[PDB]
């Protein structure tokens, strides 16, 4: 992915996750737990369901058109009723080929977009309270229970009332 | 470096889904890469029965379309009828008088588009000649007949005199006019049947005319017969006249067939007609139209995928799969 | 923080993007409608409601078709030696001469049209034996009866019609192409009275091609005091190349040959005025703006033109994501 | 956005700024400031500026074509010029519509771009003398006039001068 | 310093990069490119791959019907017909209506294997010649046509009959003569007015002689238009005619091909090339190519455009 | 680019880098020095290499077909012909012109992504004990010969050896 975070500093995907595509897991004295991030989940399923109408008109009829099997040599007429009809299908096949090609590159693209920016919404949050340990974890330098996980979780996290207990921690 | 992680410290790690078995998609950047989920867009299996519940559908059976329309004894049963879609099997056949139409092909083009056979009689008046020829290659029956829509006409007593008649469209649709000539196996025949030893047919209306000149000679035997007719059309517009000239060889009209324009069309095909329900069909039978492309067939019929090479195309719907360990 | 008043030692810098308060709707690939700050219409759908005759040279046919004008229609006098880009036909336009019939009549108008020119040379013929300018109470020249100022009609002189014969090579370094003509009378009197022979018959060649026509006796429908036609033929000959003609009766001659260029140019159907504009794309609809890529006013254009397109409106966001305050 | 910076960690646009399309707006001891980057702003006008031109030309001259229009019911041959104009429309028509989604969806993306880019020159010029407060907001640690904000606007300021000051007051 | 490292990262360039268009940019330049577009052809087509057939002075039609400077084409079969814009004939003038259709029927099917029949023609004079027409410096003919005249003083009405019994189609070429005046026509055929009727259970064709003058060619005043008909498996070629009729000699086999015929002046000679243009074999390496919309074989798409260069490189910034 | 890394915060791209696209240059104790990154360069080719393949299909066979030059002139059934092949040439030159630019749009910034990958790669490996110059360069805050230089390069870099250090030389 061209963020690398999906395969790329996140190691692997969570198998026992199936409440939403992206979330959190954590540890504190409290234990450890999973919960899903559904803001991030809804970005990206907006974004691929049913994203083929966004481009492709929805399926209309036809009727009477032009003869496309011949059981006789005719020649000349019968030689442009089939070049016609062999160019149509050929255009509208590389354009099959080529849509589904572009549109798989943007579901890859997309997906590892959220992925990194919930990330990154989450360092922001957290401000000089912690660490970045790699592999898509935070180090947290402050006691943290599952109420204030909860707060980092629905964007609610003060880092003010913890960062003199944090700044402790993290430089002695 | 202490094993137990402190009270004054917490953990925060952020992930993705992943399933067990994943499924191979293309993208721009990889010939195969594993996403969580993915779609098929292609269409490959048809029903193998064509659905009668959304169109009209008319089983041709042992008939083609020009063979029920002429009146050829054996299609009489599709008197008058009308369809979205006419199935013309392959095991049809002809069983009336020998004929061909140039450019056949325009004239079932036509007559299929129109999606009707409704057929109106009108009196034409054929002073001093012979009505209602027939031919024992064109049994109605026990008796000997000709296709139910057209005029065989010759020589009473002695003469054929020149016909002159004409049949003005006072009415607010396109008349279609089904006539023809007949083509003599020998100048012996021609003299005997119509007199004159050069046939003529002259069908005209305001601005347009075709002029047709009948053939003669040995022809292979058809049904025991080695004349033949030529099959020709004409459309007359509202406001506008038909006039019909001849000394010889005509295969009258009786009337006119209603002309529409309509949705309907002809398909080939020895699929089996069945109740089920498809607003999209092919020679295979009828298909499922939720894809967006379909591989069975490049001749369709309705509300249809369009028709692509590849059999399969699938459309990545989830993330890329990253199984855990 | 708090503090109401900020310190001195200490600064905020805030990075951000600009915002309209009425912003306009989108699509993309992620988003059905998503605002931006700024958008195009890249679909032209209004048209100038007239033709600009100022960037292609554009030539009214008012009540002339261009056939007629070629065949020197007595009301088509005044297209004499034109020339165009673009020849535009009306629907009101009528003929108004002895009537006639051209098989394949869209080929020829075509032909002409894309020639771009109406250059005509008059050509020396022998007509030994015959009567020439045969004129017609249909075709009202002035006060006099007359007839295609392009075309030649011969009858019998004295007691016969000998059988013609004439020669005419083409000693440019230009195609060229000669129109002509056969006659179809009513009735056997008339045939006898204009030709003497019971058939006529034209045979037109050149070293690599041949054109034979008969006439069919007959009545047409009246038109204009007239129930004979006409039938109008051409012949193109290369360079090189010679033109031969012979006729025992009917022949409706040449007089000349009309220039062929390979043009850039054509004819269209419309009804809308011709006015002072600039204008380098021509539909049915009027002359259109070229500035859009797309449009969807007609599918018959002419000159420089946006591609016509199903789709009545399409959006280009010029802008970023418009999140307003 | 897949850079999550416009309508994203930026809260919103500035209605205000009239005179660029990314820009600063400050607050100091001389008081309340705002100026436009042309720089970013730039780039991002000469890529959105008719981006059609480079895939599709502006007008093709076409001259004589094929009728398009029919008065009579002629059949076989009417039929094939109905439907390879009707093939023609429909692939012009999936064209367009494919081009513009792309067209607009590539907009999005180098526009948000140019957005997080532009914050990221800033961070990587401000080093240790300043913290991200989310909201694409920096609290800058020291005295800081109208000159020393020029000096980060136009890529000269040094942060060797302020750390000091700056890592004193971010730690107390 | 000891107490500290320098670590950059950075990637690499070329002091000579090419130009590419993307999306975003008119032009930019990348480290590596490549083209796209063939548009130099070998100047000559190669005759390895597919079997090529240069017709010299004849054209297809020509060396099916047997014009005299054709015959070393008897019996010949091709992947693609070269015809030289310089092609003549030079046998009895004559005019084929349909003459495209019939030639593309034949280019298509690749063959000119050709059948002799047995036709008894009762009562009338065979393999009649002309000095259009000539061969060894005689006096000849079409050398798969007969052309029949009057015997004595008779031409009896001809009637002939000859069944398909093969798995194939049989395609018939026969013709009718145009005699240059009434005289003529009396003097060849003994009836003032001729006729030729050739059908099938499925079809039938009748025509009528034109007795006139035509422009004179090697000698001839008069003119012969030829015609085609198929026979299919089953079914039965009757030909019936009291005048004019230049017949059949057997027939030809018509298949199923992947052949074509194609117009080119090039020279022919052996090379590797698996696609065939008007201007000589091409390269199909590229995608695209530029050289003629007229292609035969595996072959690139033909596109408006000279160049297209494709990006194979990252962006090229080259140093300070 | 859409990163910023090529022509961006990365001044320049290096002529003297002839083993890889992407590499490491550094000075230490020992001196200078310079490396190329494998697993970019690779993900970079890997990606490039033979990328019309994905859409483009591999060349197929055309025998006969419909006549596109004419000596006569005939009208309307030539006019088709000539049509329908101008129509057929002018979407394909669109395709062509379209998957160019598309193409070399993806591959400008699919290796601008790589760049903006190593470089993130390499700051969170750093942690605390560095910081961003700008310029695409680390200052390590920490004595760091060859060896230590080393274990970043194959990523086994562990930063909690050097923390004090670092952090000590930081502030
Ligand atoms: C020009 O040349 C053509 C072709 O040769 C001639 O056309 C043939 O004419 C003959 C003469 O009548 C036809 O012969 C007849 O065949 C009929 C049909 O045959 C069926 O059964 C046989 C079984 O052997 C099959 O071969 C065939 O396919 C059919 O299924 C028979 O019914 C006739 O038989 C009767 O003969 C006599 C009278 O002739 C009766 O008294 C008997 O009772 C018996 O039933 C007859 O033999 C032949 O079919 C025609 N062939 C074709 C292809 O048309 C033209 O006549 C000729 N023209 C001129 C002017 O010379
Ligand atoms: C084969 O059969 C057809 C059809 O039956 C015949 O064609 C008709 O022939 C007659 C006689 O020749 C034609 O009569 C002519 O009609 C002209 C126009 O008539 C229409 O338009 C006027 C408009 O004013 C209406 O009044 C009228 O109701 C019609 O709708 C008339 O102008 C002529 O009639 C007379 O006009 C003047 C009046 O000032 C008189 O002085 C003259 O005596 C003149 O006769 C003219 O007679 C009729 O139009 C033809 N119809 C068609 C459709 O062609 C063929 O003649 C016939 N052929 C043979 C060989 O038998
Ligand atoms: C209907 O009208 C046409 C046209 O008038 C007549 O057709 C012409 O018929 C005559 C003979 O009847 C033809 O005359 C012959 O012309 C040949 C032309 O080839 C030459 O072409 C040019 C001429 O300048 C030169 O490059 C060069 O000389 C070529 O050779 C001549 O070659 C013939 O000459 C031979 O015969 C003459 C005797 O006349 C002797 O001097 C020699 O032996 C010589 O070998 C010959 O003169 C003429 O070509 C025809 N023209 C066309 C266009 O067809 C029809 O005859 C007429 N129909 C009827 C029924 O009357
Ligand atoms: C041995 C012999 O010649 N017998 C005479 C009959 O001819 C032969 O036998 C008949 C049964 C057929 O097999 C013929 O093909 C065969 O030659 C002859 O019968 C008549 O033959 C003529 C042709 O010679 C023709 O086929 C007649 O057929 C009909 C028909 O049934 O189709 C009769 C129809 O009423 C008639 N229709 C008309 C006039 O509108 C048609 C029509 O003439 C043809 O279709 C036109 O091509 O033919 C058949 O009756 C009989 C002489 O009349 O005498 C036997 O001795
Ligand atoms: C001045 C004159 O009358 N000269 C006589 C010759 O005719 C002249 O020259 C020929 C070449 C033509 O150009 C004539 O138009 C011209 O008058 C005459 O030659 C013979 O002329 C006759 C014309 O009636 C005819 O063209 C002869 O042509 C052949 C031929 O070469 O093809 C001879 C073939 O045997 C014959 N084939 C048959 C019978 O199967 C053909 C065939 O009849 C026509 O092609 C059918 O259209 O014609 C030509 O030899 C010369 C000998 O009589 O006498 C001169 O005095
Ligand atoms: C009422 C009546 O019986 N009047 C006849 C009259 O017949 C009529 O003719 C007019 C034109 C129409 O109304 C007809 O329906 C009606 O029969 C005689 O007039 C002549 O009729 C001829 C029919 O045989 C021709 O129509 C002829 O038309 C001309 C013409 O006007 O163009 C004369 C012209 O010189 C001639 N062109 C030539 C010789 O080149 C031309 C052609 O012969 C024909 O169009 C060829 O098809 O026709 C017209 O004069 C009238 C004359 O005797 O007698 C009344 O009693
Ligand atoms: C990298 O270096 C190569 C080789 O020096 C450059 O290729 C050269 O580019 C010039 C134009 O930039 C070409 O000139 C063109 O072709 C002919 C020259 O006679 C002329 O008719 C045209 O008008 C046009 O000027 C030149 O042919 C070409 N030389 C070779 C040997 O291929 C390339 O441009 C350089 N690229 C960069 C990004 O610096
Ligand atoms: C970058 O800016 C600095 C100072 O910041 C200036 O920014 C301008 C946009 C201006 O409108 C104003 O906000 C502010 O003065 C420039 O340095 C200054 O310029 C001249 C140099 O001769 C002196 O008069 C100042 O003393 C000097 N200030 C400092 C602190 O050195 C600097 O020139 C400019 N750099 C570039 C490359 O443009
Ligand atoms: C990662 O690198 C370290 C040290 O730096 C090494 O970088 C390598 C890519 C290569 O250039 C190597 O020559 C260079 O020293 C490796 O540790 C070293 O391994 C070598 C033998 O391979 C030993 O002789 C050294 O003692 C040892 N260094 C130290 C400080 O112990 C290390 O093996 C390598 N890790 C992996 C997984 O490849
Ligand atoms: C072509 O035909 C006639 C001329 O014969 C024109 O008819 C006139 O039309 C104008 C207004 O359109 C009116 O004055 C009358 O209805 C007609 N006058 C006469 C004397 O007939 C007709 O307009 C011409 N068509 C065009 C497009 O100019
Ligand atoms: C378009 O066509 C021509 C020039 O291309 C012009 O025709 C003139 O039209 C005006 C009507 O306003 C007439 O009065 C003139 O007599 C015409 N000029 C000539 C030289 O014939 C005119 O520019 C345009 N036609 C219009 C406006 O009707
Ligand atoms: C945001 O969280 C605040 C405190 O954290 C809660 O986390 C939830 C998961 C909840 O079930 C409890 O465990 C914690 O109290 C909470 O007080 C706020 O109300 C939340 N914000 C909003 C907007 O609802
Ligand atoms: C936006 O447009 C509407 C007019 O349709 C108007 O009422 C409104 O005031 C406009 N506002 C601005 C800020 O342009």
């Known amino acids: ?172 | 470096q202490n094993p137990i992680s402190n009270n004054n410290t917490a953990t925060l790690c952020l992930g993705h889904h992943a399933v067990a078995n994943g499924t191979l998609v293309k993208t721009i950047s990889d010939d195969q890469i594993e996403v969580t989920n993915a779609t098929e867009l292609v269409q490959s299996i048809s029903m193998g029965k064509i659905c009668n519940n959304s169109y009209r559908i008319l089983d041709g059976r042992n008939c083609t379309l020009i063979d029920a329309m002429l009146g050829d004894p054996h299609c009489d049963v599709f008197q008058y009828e009308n369809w979205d879609l006419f199935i013309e099997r392959s095991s049809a056949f002809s069983n009336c008088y020998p004929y061909d139409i140039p450019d056949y092909a325009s004239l079932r083009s036509i007559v299929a588009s129109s999606g009707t056979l409704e057929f109106t009689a009108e009196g034409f008046t054929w002073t001093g000649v012979t009505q209602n020829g027939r031919s024992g290659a064109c049994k109605r029956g026990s008796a000997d007949s000709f296709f139910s829509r057209l005029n065989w006409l010759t020589k009473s007593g002695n003469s054929y005199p020149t016909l002159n008649v004409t049949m003005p469209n006072n009415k607010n649709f396109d008349k279609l006019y089904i006539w023809g000539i007949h083509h003599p196996s020998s100048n012996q025949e021609q003299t005997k049947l119509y007199i004159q030893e050069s046939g003529r047919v002259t069908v005209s209306t305001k601005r347009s005319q075709q002029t047709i000149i009948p053939n003669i000679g040995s022809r292979p035997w058809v049904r025991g017969q080695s004349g033949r007719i030529s099959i020709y059309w004409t459309i007359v517009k509202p406001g506008d006249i038909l006039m019909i000239n001849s000394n010889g060889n005509l295969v009258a009209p009786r009337g006119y067939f209603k002309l529409k324009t309509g949705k309907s069309s002809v398909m080939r095909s020895d699929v089996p007609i069945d109740i089920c329900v498809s607003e999209c069909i092919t020679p295979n039978g009828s298909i499922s139209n939720e894809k967006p492309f379909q591989n069975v067939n490049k001749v369709t019929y309705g509300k249809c995928p369009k028709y692509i090479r590849q059999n399969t195309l699938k459309l990545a719907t989830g993330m890329r799969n990253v199984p855990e360990k």
């Not at chain 1, 099959?96 to 990194?116: F, G, P, R, S, Y």
């Open chain 1, 1 to 172: 992915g061209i963020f690398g975070a999906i395969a790329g500093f996140i190691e692997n995907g969570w198998e026992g996750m199936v409440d939403g595509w992206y979330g959190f897991r954590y540890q504190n004295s409290e234990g450890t737990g999973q919960a899903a991030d559904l803001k991030s989940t809804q970005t990206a399923i907006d974004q691929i369901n049913e994203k083929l109408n966004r481009v492709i008109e929805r399926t209309n009829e036809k009727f009477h058109q032009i003869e496309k099997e011949f059981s006789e040599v005719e020649g000349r007429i019968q030689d442009l009723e089939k070049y016609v009809e062999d160019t149509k299908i050929d255009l509208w096949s590389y354009n099959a080929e080529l849509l589904v090609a572009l549109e798989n590159q943007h579901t890859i693209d997309l997906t590892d977009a959220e992925m990194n920016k919930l990330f990154e919404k989450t360092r922001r949050q957290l401000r000089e309270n912690a660490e970045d340990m790699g592999g898509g974890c935070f180090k947290i330098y402050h006691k943290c229970d599952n109420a204030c996980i909860g707060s980092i979780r629905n964007g609610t996290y003060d880092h003010y009332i913890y960062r003199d207990e944090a700044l402790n921690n993290r430089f002695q």
